[PDB]
Amino acid sequence: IEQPRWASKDSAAGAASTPDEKIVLEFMDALTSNDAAKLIEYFAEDTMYQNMPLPPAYGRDAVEQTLAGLFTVMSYDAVETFHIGSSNGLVYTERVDVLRALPTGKSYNVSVLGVFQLTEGKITGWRDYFDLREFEEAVDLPLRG
Amino acid sequence: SKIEQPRWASKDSAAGAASTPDEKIVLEFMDALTSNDAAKLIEYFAEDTMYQNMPLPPAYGRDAVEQTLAGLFTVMSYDAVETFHIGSSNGLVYTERVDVLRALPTGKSYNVSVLGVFQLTEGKITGWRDYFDLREFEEAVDLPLRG
Numbered sequence: 001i002e003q004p005r006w007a008s009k010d011s012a013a014g015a016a017s018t019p020d021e022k023i024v025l026e027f028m029d030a031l032t033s034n035d036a037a038k039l040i041e042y043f044a045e046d047t048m049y050q051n052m053p054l055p056p057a058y059g060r061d062a063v064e065q066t067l068a069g070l071f072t073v074m075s076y077d078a079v080e081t082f083h084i085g086s087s088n089g090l091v092y093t094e095r096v097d098v099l100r101a102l103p104t105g106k107s108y109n110v111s112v113l114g115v116f117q118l119t120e121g122k123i124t125g126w127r128d129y130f131d132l133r134e135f136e137e138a139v140d141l142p143l144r145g
Numbered sequence: 146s147k148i149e150q151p152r153w154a155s156k157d158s159a160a161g162a163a164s165t166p167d168e169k170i171v172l173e174f175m176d177a178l179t180s181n182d183a184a185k186l187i188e189y190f191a192e193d194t195m196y197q198n199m200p201l202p203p204a205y206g207r208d209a210v211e212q213t214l215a216g217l218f219t220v221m222s223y224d225a226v227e228t229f230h231i232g233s234s235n236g237l238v239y240t241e242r243v244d245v246l247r248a249l250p251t252g253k254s255y256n257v258s259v260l261g262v263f264q265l266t267e268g269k270i271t272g273w274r275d276y277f278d279l280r281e282f283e284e285a286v287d288l289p290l291r292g
Contacts, residue, residue, distance in 0.1 A: 050153070089157050092232065113276040117155055131199060132278050134200060
């Protein structure tokens with residue numbers, strides 16, 4: 001994967017400085033496992049999940065339905081984290097997701113900046129920011145259209 | 146014109162406010178965004194800086210950054226910048242906001258969900274990278290900016 005001009009090679013910024021940062025870094029290694037069963041155990045029952053160009057999931061049940069649904073048509077082949085920071089109960093990861101669109105077998109590097117809210121070491125919020133359209137026209141999978 | 150705060154926005158009262166010096170810089174820069182002045186905004190930048198709204202190409206050095214900002218203000222006006230979350234670590238500042246944008250060609254407005262990262266040394270911006278869904282904004286205000 002690409003390590004951009006702007007991504008500092010002070011390779012921490014980039015490592016976990018707080019326990020939450022270590023949880024978020026752990027969570028994203030579970031991402032490449034591609035099973036929403038293992039991922040959902042990091043969530044509190046009162047929680048959210050929203051890839052922002054798509055509609056949000058609220059509560060633990062809805063989050064599982066969305067994660068699972070994603071894995072029905074896509075796969076994480078790699079998650080690369082350049083910058084990880086945290087203030088005020090919030091973690092921020094500026095990373096790159098390597099996604100294989102399952103129905104078309106095609107792959108893409110999604111540049112993504114995410115925010116996680118943790119509460120007693122449980123994810124109470126997860127919001128991924130990126131351009132949905134450039135993912136779609138690159139892997140032929142219009143996830144909204 | 147007015148943003149209502151989403152139900153997921155952290156209720157920690159500090160999350161909303163500037164938690165460090167770097168953060169209040171980045172917060173004030175955000176208000177200068179409503180000045181729609183690339184020459185005013187370019188002030189906040191160290192000169193070995195960069196800028197990238199992430200569905201668009203990166204601009205490196207203040208040269209491009211001011212010019213890139215300049216080209217955007219040709220078809221766009223920031224009406225408002227509502228910052229829900231702001232935090233910092235290891236020299237970077239992150240803002241989770243809503244940008245109330247208006248297309249000068251069509252007059253239409255759309256509130257764009259942004260997570261931005263600002264790289265700060267100096268007290269001067271050395272990197273600024275906005276993440277958001279571009280297609281959503283374009284369709285909404287009818288102003289193709291990539292297609």
